[PDB]
Amino acid sequence: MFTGSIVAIVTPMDEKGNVCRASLKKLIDYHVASGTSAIVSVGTTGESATLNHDEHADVVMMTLDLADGRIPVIAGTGANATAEAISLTQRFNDSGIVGCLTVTPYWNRPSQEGLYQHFKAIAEHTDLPQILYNVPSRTGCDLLPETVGRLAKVKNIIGIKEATGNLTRVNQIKELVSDDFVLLSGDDASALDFMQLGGHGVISVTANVAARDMAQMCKLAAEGHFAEARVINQRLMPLHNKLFVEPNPIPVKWACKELGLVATDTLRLPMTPITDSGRETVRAALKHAGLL
Amino acid sequence: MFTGSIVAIVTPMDEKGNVCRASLKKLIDYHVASGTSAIVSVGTTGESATLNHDEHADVVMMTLDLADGRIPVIAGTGANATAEAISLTQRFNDSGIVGCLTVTPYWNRPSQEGLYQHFKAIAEHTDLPQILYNVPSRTGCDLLPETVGRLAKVKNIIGIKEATGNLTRVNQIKELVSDDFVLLSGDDASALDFMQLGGHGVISVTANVAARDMAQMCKLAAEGHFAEARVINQRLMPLHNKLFVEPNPIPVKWACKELGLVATDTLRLPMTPITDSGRETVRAALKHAGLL
Amino acid sequence: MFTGSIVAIVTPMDEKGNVCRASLKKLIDYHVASGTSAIVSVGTTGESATLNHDEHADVVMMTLDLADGRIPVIAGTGANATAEAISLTQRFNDSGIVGCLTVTPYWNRPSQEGLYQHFKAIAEHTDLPQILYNVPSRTGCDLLPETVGRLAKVKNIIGIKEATGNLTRVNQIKELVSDDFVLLSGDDASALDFMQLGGHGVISVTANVAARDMAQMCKLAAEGHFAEARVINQRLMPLHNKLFVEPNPIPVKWACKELGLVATDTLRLPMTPITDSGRETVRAALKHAGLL
Amino acid sequence: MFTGSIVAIVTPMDEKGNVCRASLKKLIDYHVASGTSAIVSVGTTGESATLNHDEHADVVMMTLDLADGRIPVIAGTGANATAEAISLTQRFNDSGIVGCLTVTPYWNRPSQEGLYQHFKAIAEHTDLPQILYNVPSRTGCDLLPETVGRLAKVKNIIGIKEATGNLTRVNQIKELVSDDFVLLSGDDASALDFMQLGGHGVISVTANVAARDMAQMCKLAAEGHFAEARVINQRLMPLHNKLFVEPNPIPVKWACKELGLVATDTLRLPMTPITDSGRETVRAALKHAGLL
Ligand SMILES: [K+]
Ligand SMILES: [K+]
Ligand SMILES: [K+]
Ligand SMILES: [K+]
């Protein structure tokens, strides 16, 4: 699955900062029950930045195990070095994941030619479907529509997670790609707008804690019932915004613990515990969404 | 040594992307002869992003060995996970380096408190001097002057490579820190203004190819001879700008190859070969510098 | 009319910089023939900045005369001083114009409270319908959705020309206003996207020289035929972009002269004649739209 | 006089928004006593935006009359139409003012060539010295250093009020212009750094309420006593920032009323009364300055 409501799932941890299997199972069961279309395992919200490659691979395998064929699983596979992006992708060849989410190199700011060569190479070393992931605010570089057009000509490059929040990109990329190239929002607060312009779903942070509504909203969207969708959206909007009151996933982990979905809200440095003010803000947002 | 002209040295590579010892030796001899104050080994310009930790450690050791006591060496040790930053620093304990250049976490966008805890933990677990490194354009986060002031109270956090190009930062930081905290520009094009405002030197890309002029410019500025320094700077300005016409270190490695300082201008993906138009911009800048 | 394709009509001038009546008549006849819904007289594209209030009023009256009841006419009435915005609006009370387009004060950067008080007062001194006009790039201030919500409660404040190009604003403003509050794009290149999200039309520069297509496109949009609309849009897109290759209305005046629609492309300082390179770019864009 | 501390003087108004001669007299006497170098009359801080040309001329004449030869007066004369700028300048010929402060056209966003022709024409039709005025944040256009260099060759274009806060501009401009061209900060918070880099003074909002300290700070900076100047600046810094907590001149007129320098703190729409929270920020800044 590469459409509807996809969760960018948190990696829940015990107090030592290591993945908590009971909490992960609970989270995966929740997504199955809720109608979530797929899981992104160890993306940005899953703390890929602070997990090493073995720890990252362990979490992917465990998620796939616990999914037990009931919900598809996409692995986060992004790296700023093309060699390392290839090597991480190779870990999951034959794993049972259905695709990889691969971020534009962060830090090193490659040209458009570099972003093309980076992704072309990654795709050539795998049979797995690739979803491009563009988020200039965290990376310092921006994958432009014309380059996405170029990369969509690659057989196993099948979609983009567009996390700029720049809605003009939906139709700019769409005119350049074939009809089966998938366009996913990576920005919760603009994701219904994104779908209304022709997007096919969202890789969502909000879905962590409001998975039924999110699944519902995206179904309505896909059916063209935007006014109906929009009522759910307005309910969720304080969460769409306030899950980023502090750096993600600091707020969404707290919100998971508060809803009894994970055992602890522990994160790895440089992520720090939610502040008192942030805790009151996310609680207000949860109340507004009717989640308690 | 943490003042004056400090080179962010390229990691010269053969056609296979492997460190070239002979090219490194030439570059180190060049810096010893040209009066460069120190060498930043495997920083951003040294392609830290695309070397793994073993290659990274290898280049630092090789640099230190070749320097043979003639020039101080500072290791790039930044990482986005605090544990990984700490662990990389441990590799360089007792190595003979004089200090570390440690970047603000990139990608994950921590809060100011998170950066505080990041750098505090790194400094705690080493005796080596630590130079903080701010470059929001690549990292998506900005270490603010206030958090710098808090960090400067840590005994072994001794300076900052301020790479924003925002010159108001010089005196915002200076008023918060003790007289002996070192302020270094990480932006070649504004580095002379940075020093005129109170900064102590530069960690420089331009210095890779204009070592002597950079060293003289920085000594003049330290002496308050800004008008004299500026004459040199006006001749180095095209190079200050066009060394970034394509992503650093693409132009500067091409420059080094053109001067005969390195055997090849090879980089690792996602860095790609210089375009023809870049060759001409860079060659023009070199000639304006009087280097060709 | 406050929906469909509204032209932000150029004020054509003879070589002395004074309105050319023959060219204006020709332009108005063209819009009638073409199916344009309304004319904005002496907005930004009509050079309100360089016309004095008497000259501005003369052009409005002449346009209304020449329209001869065949096409509705909206007067530009924006001023940065509330007194002067009121006095200009008063000139057109009982003129036969159907509404006023009124820009957020430029230069002085009022708060949201100030923008509220400015527009509330303007609306209180007239019976004419008011369209808010938001274009932060030219004004240095931004009318936020919440303030537009506040102002839509005023009886004669009936719509907004949203010229930010920020598509997220369509649904942000829409949730805050009643169903009959009109939402108009003021950005040609994103205007179909804007309509697709729920907008009701566009105040267009492109419509100056491609009025049939624009009228056609907006009809399709309003009918929900976006794929069909989008084909016209792709035809017009080089014009949407290149009519701003030089400051507006420098390119659209040249394009009008080239199509034989105005006698001359004369503008008032600080607008300068189109450059040779700009002339070749706008000609290419016109050829692409199939206009010759 | 075009060096040192120059005040962008408020236009004091009674409760009806009319110039208050008695409050203006007090302010002028205050500047004569406090060693202010000159007075900018009816600039941005003097609410040029909301006075018509007759009121504008009236305030300038009244200021000049009250100054009575004791302090030089510079008129704000900027306008967005070249004809109107020229025509406003003619009003001040033979008035006794020493020069004009003329803003880059706001709103209409001319090209660099257009700004060149704008200022060239203004300078042509007067013998009065002209100070260019760059503030992109209010105008939406940026006079670049290159266009400044071209303009500085005009005999009576003698300086620039650089109000961007971008300190790299100081030496980009200085290298292009002759030694006698005057560079003035129009950004209070970065004005000392601006002078330390080579600027000759400031056209200041802070000077309205901290005239003596501003004059001393600027004399120290001119003498190269930057450390001494900076002590004063650190005490003026909260005022440098919080005089812009609400749109200028709202905070500074409230400040002037609080010190008893003006009878009322009344402004013209779209400026609105200071909020209660602004009162407290500003009162705190005044106390930190030692003024209350
Ligand atoms: K494909
Ligand atoms: K320290
Ligand atoms: K209304
Ligand atoms: K001159």
PDB file of C-alpha atoms in Angstrom, chain B residues 6 14 20 55 153 155 164 178 181 188 226 267 278 281 285:
ATOM      1  CA  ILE B   6      42.561  27.721   9.661  1.00  0.00           C
ATOM      2  CA  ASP B  14      42.020   8.883  -6.144  1.00  0.00           C
ATOM      3  CA  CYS B  20      45.314   9.754  -1.684  1.00  0.00           C
ATOM      4  CA  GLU B  55      37.847   6.192   7.025  1.00  0.00           C
ATOM      5  CA  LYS B 153      30.764  28.146  30.717  1.00  0.00           C
ATOM      6  CA  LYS B 155      35.520  24.458  30.727  1.00  0.00           C
ATOM      7  CA  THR B 164      25.737  31.693   9.084  1.00  0.00           C
ATOM      8  CA  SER B 178      34.559  35.434  28.330  1.00  0.00           C
ATOM      9  CA  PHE B 181      36.347  32.291  23.920  1.00  0.00           C
ATOM     10  CA  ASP B 188      34.582  32.970   3.599  1.00  0.00           C
ATOM     11  CA  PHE B 226      41.574  46.317   8.100  1.00  0.00           C
ATOM     12  CA  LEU B 267      34.520  13.216  -4.785  1.00  0.00           C
ATOM     13  CA  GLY B 278      31.760  25.815 -13.088  1.00  0.00           C
ATOM     14  CA  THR B 281      33.807  30.558 -13.144  1.00  0.00           C
ATOM     15  CA  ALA B 285      38.258  33.431  -9.791  1.00  0.00           C
TER      16      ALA B 285
END
